Amino acid sequence: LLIEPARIEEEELTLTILRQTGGLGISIAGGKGSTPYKGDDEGIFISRVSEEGPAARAGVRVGDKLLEVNGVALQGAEHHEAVEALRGAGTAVQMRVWRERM
Amino acid sequence: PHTNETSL
Ligand SMILES: [Cl-]
Asked: What does UniProt give as the signal peptide span (chain B)?
């Protein structure tokens, strides 16, 4: 009958966040030794994005898996290590993220 | 058990 449309299964991005006083406006969840956010994945996922915050205006979304921040790779990283990587972030934060659809 | 969450 009819055909399925072209679909983007997964995606990798870079979103330059410009932290205005008050933080990035997001919450992270997961880490090596923590309860996975998706399946058994121990990555650093974005658990919230305060709308009209810095990270929202930049394109970040809930569930985006945080891979790298300003040249620092979060591969196998614990939670607090991803917390401290983002606390010395500076006024400009370039993250590499990963996503799924729906 | 271990459920972590941190505002930023
Ligand atoms: Cl922590």
From this structure: none
The single-letter DSSP state of residue A91 is S
The runs of H, that is alpha helices, within chain A are 54-57, 79-87
Contact at CB, B8 and A30, closer than 8 angstroms: no
Partner-chain residue, chosen from A27, A31, A79, that has the shortest CB–CB distance to B7: A27
* Elucidation technique: X-ray
Do the Cβ atoms of A32 and A78 come closer than 8 Å? Answer: yes
Domain ranges of chain A: 9-102
User: How much distance in Å is there from the Cα of A15 to the middle of ligand 1?
Assistant: 24
